[PDB]
Structures are given as structure tokens and as C-alpha cells.
Scaffold this active site. Sequence first.
Site, short mmCIF file in Angstrom:
data_model
loop_
_atom_site.label_atom_id
_atom_site.label_comp_id
_atom_site.label_asym_id
_atom_site.label_seq_id
_atom_site.Cartn_x
_atom_site.Cartn_y
_atom_site.Cartn_z
N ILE A 9 0.82 -1.22 0.00
CA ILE A 9 0.00 0.00 0.00
C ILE A 9 0.86 1.28 0.00
O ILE A 9 0.59 2.24 0.72
CB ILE A 9 -1.07 -0.02 1.14
CG1 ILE A 9 -0.45 -0.44 2.51
CG2 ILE A 9 -2.25 -0.91 0.73
CD1 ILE A 9 -1.35 -0.30 3.70
N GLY A 10 1.87 1.29 -0.87
CA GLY A 10 2.80 2.40 -1.01
C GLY A 10 4.05 2.23 -0.17
O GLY A 10 4.14 1.29 0.63
N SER A 11 5.02 3.14 -0.33
CA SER A 11 6.27 3.06 0.42
C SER A 11 6.86 4.41 0.85
O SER A 11 7.04 5.31 0.02
CB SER A 11 7.31 2.25 -0.35
OG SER A 11 7.58 2.82 -1.62
N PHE A 36 11.43 5.07 5.48
CA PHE A 36 11.71 4.13 6.57
C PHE A 36 10.50 3.21 6.87
O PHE A 36 9.81 3.40 7.88
CB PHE A 36 12.23 4.86 7.83
CG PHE A 36 13.48 5.69 7.65
CD1 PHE A 36 14.67 5.10 7.22
CD2 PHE A 36 13.49 7.04 7.97
CE1 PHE A 36 15.83 5.86 7.07
CE2 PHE A 36 14.66 7.80 7.82
CZ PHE A 36 15.82 7.21 7.37
N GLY A 37 10.28 2.24 5.98
CA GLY A 37 9.21 1.26 6.12
C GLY A 37 8.35 0.99 4.90
O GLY A 37 7.56 1.84 4.48
N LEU A 38 8.47 -0.25 4.35
CA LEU A 38 7.67 -0.74 3.23
C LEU A 38 6.35 -1.24 3.83
O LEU A 38 6.32 -2.26 4.53
CB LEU A 38 8.40 -1.89 2.51
CG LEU A 38 9.28 -1.50 1.32
CD1 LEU A 38 10.41 -2.49 1.14
CD2 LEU A 38 8.46 -1.40 0.04
N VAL A 39 5.27 -0.48 3.62
CA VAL A 39 3.95 -0.80 4.17
C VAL A 39 3.22 -1.85 3.33
O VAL A 39 3.32 -1.85 2.11
CB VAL A 39 3.08 0.47 4.43
CG1 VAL A 39 1.96 0.18 5.43
CG2 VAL A 39 3.94 1.63 4.95
N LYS A 68 -24.22 -14.84 24.74
CA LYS A 68 -25.55 -15.01 25.31
C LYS A 68 -26.37 -15.89 24.38
O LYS A 68 -26.39 -15.68 23.17
CB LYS A 68 -26.23 -13.65 25.51
CG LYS A 68 -27.42 -13.64 26.45
CD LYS A 68 -28.00 -12.23 26.51
CE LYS A 68 -29.11 -12.05 27.51
NZ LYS A 68 -28.64 -12.14 28.92
N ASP A 82 -34.29 -3.02 34.15
CA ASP A 82 -33.70 -3.94 35.13
C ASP A 82 -32.34 -3.48 35.66
O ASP A 82 -31.41 -4.28 35.80
CB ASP A 82 -33.63 -5.37 34.56
CG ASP A 82 -33.95 -6.48 35.55
OD1 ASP A 82 -33.39 -6.47 36.67
OD2 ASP A 82 -34.74 -7.40 35.18
C1 LIG Z 1 -15.29 -15.19 40.17
N1 LIG Z 1 -14.98 -14.15 39.18
C2 LIG Z 1 -14.36 -12.97 39.80
C3 LIG Z 1 -14.14 -14.64 38.07
C4 LIG Z 1 -15.04 -14.98 36.88
C5 LIG Z 1 -14.60 -14.31 35.57
C6 LIG Z 1 -13.95 -15.30 34.61
C7 LIG Z 1 -12.76 -14.95 33.97
C8 LIG Z 1 -12.18 -15.82 33.05
C9 LIG Z 1 -12.79 -17.04 32.75
C10 LIG Z 1 -13.98 -17.39 33.37
C11 LIG Z 1 -14.57 -16.52 34.28
N2 LIG Z 1 -15.81 -13.84 34.88
C12 LIG Z 1 -15.89 -12.94 33.87
C13 LIG Z 1 -17.20 -12.86 33.50
N3 LIG Z 1 -17.74 -12.01 32.50
C14 LIG Z 1 -19.07 -11.99 32.20
O1 LIG Z 1 -19.86 -12.72 32.78
C15 LIG Z 1 -19.56 -11.12 31.11
N4 LIG Z 1 -18.85 -10.40 30.26
N5 LIG Z 1 -19.60 -9.80 29.40
C16 LIG Z 1 -20.93 -10.08 29.60
C17 LIG Z 1 -22.13 -9.71 28.99
C18 LIG Z 1 -23.34 -10.23 29.46
C19 LIG Z 1 -24.64 -9.80 28.86
C20 LIG Z 1 -25.83 -10.47 28.91
N6 LIG Z 1 -26.75 -9.71 28.29
N7 LIG Z 1 -26.13 -8.54 27.84
C21 LIG Z 1 -24.88 -8.59 28.18
C22 LIG Z 1 -23.36 -11.08 30.59
C23 LIG Z 1 -22.20 -11.43 31.20
C24 LIG Z 1 -20.97 -10.96 30.72
C25 LIG Z 1 -17.91 -13.79 34.27
N8 LIG Z 1 -17.09 -14.38 35.08
#
Ligand SMILES: CN(C)CC[C@@H](c1ccccc1)n1cc(NC(=O)c2n[nH]c3cc(-c4cn[nH]c4)ccc23)cn1
Length: 239
Positions: A14-16, A19-22, A36, A120
Site C-alpha cells: 500500500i505504497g512506500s 523508513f518502512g515498506l507498508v 448469550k 432492570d
Molecule cells: C469469580 N470471578 C471474579 C471470576 C469470573 C470471571 C472469569 C474470567 C475468566 C474465565 C472465566 C470466568 N468472569 C468474567 C465474567 N464475565 C461476564 O460474565 C460477562 N462479560 N460480558 C458479559 C455480557 C453479558 C450480557 C448479557 N446480556 N447482555 C450482556 C453477561 C455477562 C458478561 C464472568 N465471570
Amino acid sequence: SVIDPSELTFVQEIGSGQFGLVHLGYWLNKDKVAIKTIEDFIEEAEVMMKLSHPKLVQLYGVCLEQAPICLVFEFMEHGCLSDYLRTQRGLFAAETLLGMCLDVCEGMAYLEEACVIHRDLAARNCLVGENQVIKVSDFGPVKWASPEVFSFSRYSSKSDVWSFGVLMWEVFSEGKIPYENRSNSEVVEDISTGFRLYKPRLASTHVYQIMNHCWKERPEDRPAFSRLLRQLAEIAESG
Ligand SMILES: CN(C)CC[C@@H](c1ccccc1)n1cc(NC(=O)c2n[nH]c3cc(-c4cn[nH]c4)ccc23)cn1
């Protein structure tokens, strides 16, 4: 942060410069995401994509090729705020907890401006990410509900303000259950008579004034999220 060659694919030059061939290339990233599980909701997806804010759990895309239908979200390293508060109880400083409420309020003010009703807002629906950042999720039971919502299901951003006052309580009480040993019928009776959640020790008299303002019977008497953002931002930077 080293990139393994296998992850990279060269395409064309994408040009040059001197200092650097991109080269234009494709980078294959193995990034963590939250998925989800389940025309119907296709229209809701393209709209949620537009809702981009640093304090809102981002939607990356949707998977529609049959079986359980997926929704790809931003991964949040520390999980839900309700569990996060409970495990670190007695460990938090009041400045950390005000910072968590400011984070939520920032995202909520954006949703108010966008004319999006959460329905919620609770600590369990908020997630902890990098450097204790709090982002709002699940935007698209009585304990967090305002009188018009439990009595008539009259959602507005002002009912989200009531939910936010309950959230602030959860945060400042370090993840306690609001109206702990009361029933959904008892709660309704209590709020209607005028009862309100007590002032937690980590909450100043000014923070508690904000909580009660979110909890006024008339939705028109509750402050807007834009009003709450300016308020909590001042308490944070001043102390
Ligand atoms: C115990 N705890 C502190 C550690 C759990 C941590 C984890 C890290 C690595 C691997 C496994 C587990 N952990 C991280 C999450 N992250 C989420 O749950 C999460 N991350 N992004 C999300 C989005 C939705 C969501 C549902 N509807 N809309 C959004 C719901 C949940 C989430 C959950 N546990």
C-alpha cells in the site's frame, strides 16, 4: 505484546515511505468474548450496535445459523458487580464505591439521551472489567422497581433513576440485599407507606440525600441522569 507470524496474513503493498515498506494485512485475533444464548430480534441487534459508550457492555454481533441463536458481547474480566461487592466486603473505600456509581451513571445518562429504558438496573446486571471499571449490561424484581412500575408497569428513564438509587445502596452497603427478609407483597406495602432503605456507613450524608432523591414517589420529582452525572462527578473530583 508480540504478534506470532501465524496470526498475520500479508495481502498487497500500500505504497512506500523512506523508513518502512507498508503492506495491507489481515490479523487473526483470538479475543475473549461473552456469548448469550436464546424478523424476531434481527431489528433489535442493528440498533444495539449503534448504542456505543465506554460504560455500556458492547454488542459485537449476532450468530443466526440455526441451533441456539448467539449474541456476541464484550468480555468483562471480573464478572457481575453484585458478586464482586460481596467477595470484597469490608475491603472497600468510600471513594472506590462512589467511582462505581459514577461509572453506572455515565452509561445511564447516555441511555437517557438515546431514549433507551433499561427496565432492570441492578448491581447483578452491571459488570466489572479492567481497572475496576463498571459497565451497564442487559438493556433491551420488585426491590428495584419504582411505585409506577410495580403497580402499573409504567417504565421511563425516571423509573431507571429509582432502580439507580437501589443500585447506589447495593454498592455503598457492599452488595447487601435490599429489604433482605421481606416479601414482594411486604416491599410494596413498605415503600407505599413511605419506608426507605437505611443509610449505609460508607455513604456520606450527601450521597444518601442523592439516594432519597432517586426514591421520591412522583417520577417527575426524581432527578434526571444528566443531573445525577454532574452531581456525582463533582463529589468524585472534590472528595
Ligand atoms: C469469580 N470471578 C471474579 C471470576 C469470573 C470471571 C472469569 C474470567 C475468566 C474465565 C472465566 C470466568 N468472569 C468474567 C465474567 N464475565 C461476564 O460474565 C460477562 N462479560 N460480558 C458479559 C455480557 C453479558 C450480557 C448479557 N446480556 N447482555 C450482556 C453477561 C455477562 C458478561 C464472568 N465471570
